[PDB]
Amino acid sequence: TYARKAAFVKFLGTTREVTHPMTLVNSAFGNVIARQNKDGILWMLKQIEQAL
């Protein structure tokens, strides 16, 4: 007896936004785009971990 199976690829995503005046003001904690990207990556990692 033999079988042939199939698996389907799924998609994950999230969106991050920063307004223009936020990019112009003097902000502590360093660059803001990098901070938002790190937050998005960590949130996606947690979502993947729970979806697994």
Binding site: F11, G13, T14, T15, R16, F29, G40, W43, M44, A51
Partner: peptide, 24 residues
């Protein structure tokens, strides 16, 4: 300053060619 959360829990699956929702 403190960091509390990385975003609200709102699902992460979208589909082919669909714009994902925003988070903060």
């Amino acid at each position: 300053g403190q960091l509390l959360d990385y975003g609200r829990s709102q699902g992460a699956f979208v589909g082919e060619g669909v714009l994902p929702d925003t988070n903060d």
